[PDB]
C-alpha cells in the first residue's frame, strides 16, 4: 500500500542558463524500486530523462530517502514544458505510480 509520488512545484520558472530543480517525493517501503523522471511532449508522448539509481538531467536522493532532486542543468528555452516522475516498485509486487504533472517555464535572459 503506497500513494503516488508528488512532483513539486507545480510551476517552476527559471531563466535561460540557470539550473532548474524539481523535487519528487516518494515514501519508500523498501529499497527495491526505481524512480524515473519523465518529460511529456505536447503530442502526449513521454520521454525518460533520467532514473534513480543512475548529461544535463540529474537525480539526487536527499538524506530522508523520500525526497529526490531532479535538476535541469543549464536549462534552455526549449526545456520549457511538462514534466512528471514515476516510481516503480520491483518486488515483491511490481507497480508504477506516476505523479501529477508540473510545468517548467524557462525565460529569455
Amino acid at each position, epitope marked *: 500500500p503506497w500513494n503516488p509520488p508528488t512532483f513539486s512545484p507545480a510551476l517552476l520558472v527559471v531563466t535561460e542558463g540557470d539550473n532548474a530543480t524539481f523535487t519528487c517525493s516518494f515514501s519508500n517501503t523498501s529499497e*527495491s524500486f526505481v524512480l524515473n523522471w519523465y518529460r511529456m511532449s505536447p503530442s502526449n508522448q513521454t520521454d525518460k530523462l533520467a532514473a534513480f539509481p*543512475e548529461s544535463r538531467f540529474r537525480v539526487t536522493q536527499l538524506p530522508n530517502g523520500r525526497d529526490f532532486h531532479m535538476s535541469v542543468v543549464r536549462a534552455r528555452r526549449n526545456d520549457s514544458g511538462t514534466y512528471l516522475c514515476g516510481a*516503480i516498485s*520491483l518486488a*515483491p509486487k*511490481a507497480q508504477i505510480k506516476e505523479s501529477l504533472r508540473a510545468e517548467l517555464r524557462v525565460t529569455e535572459r
Partner: antibody
Amino acid sequence: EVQLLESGGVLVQPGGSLRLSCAASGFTFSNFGMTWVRQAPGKGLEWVSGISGGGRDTYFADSVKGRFTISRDNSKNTLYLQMNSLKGEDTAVYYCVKWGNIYFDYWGQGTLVTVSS
Amino acid sequence: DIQMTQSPSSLSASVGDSITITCRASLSINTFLNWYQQKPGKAPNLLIYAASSLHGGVPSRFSGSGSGTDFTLTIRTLQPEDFATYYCQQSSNTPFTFGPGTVVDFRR
C-alpha cells in the same frame, strides 16, 4: 562494459553446503539489485533469489527458502549465494544477473553445481 | 505463483520468414513481461522488456506486444542467428517465473 563472472561450482554431497561468488564490473555495483537464476541440464530457467542494491531486501523462490541465503559486499563488487542443506535437484548452472529494474539485462555465463552422492 | 506458458513449444522456419511466439500468464501482469533468447551452451540475453520495449543493441526485427495475460514475440525477416530458444518471463510478482521456452529451428 558489463561483466559478471561466477565461480564456485563443484561436486557436493547432498545435505552439504556451498558458496558461489560473482564478481561484477562495468557498472556501479551498489546502485543495482542483483539476482541468481539457475538452469538444470536440459531444463528451463528458474529464478532463485534476489537482493536489493543496499542489501536490506532479499527474496527467494519457495524451493530454496530456509536453505539458500543471498548476500553481497559492495566494497569488492561481489555477490554471493550461500547454498545450505543441498538436494540433488539443486544440480544446475547458476547464473549471476543484474537486477536494477523490471528486467534482467545482463547475465554471466554461469557455474555448474553438482549435488550427488 | 504465476504460471507462464508458451505456444508453440517448437517451430521450424526459413530465413526471411516472419514468425510469432505466444506467451500466456495465469493472472494479469499488465505489461511486466520480458522476452529472452538463449543459444545452446550460453547464458540468456534480454530482447524485450515491459512487453514491447526493445533492449538496446537488439535488432529492430524483434518486437513484442500485449498486456494483461496474452503476449506475443514477433521476429520479422528471420535471420540465421535467430535460431534459438525463446523464453518469456513475468516481472510482476515474486517469485519471478519463466515460460517453458520455445525452440525455433531452421526448416530444411
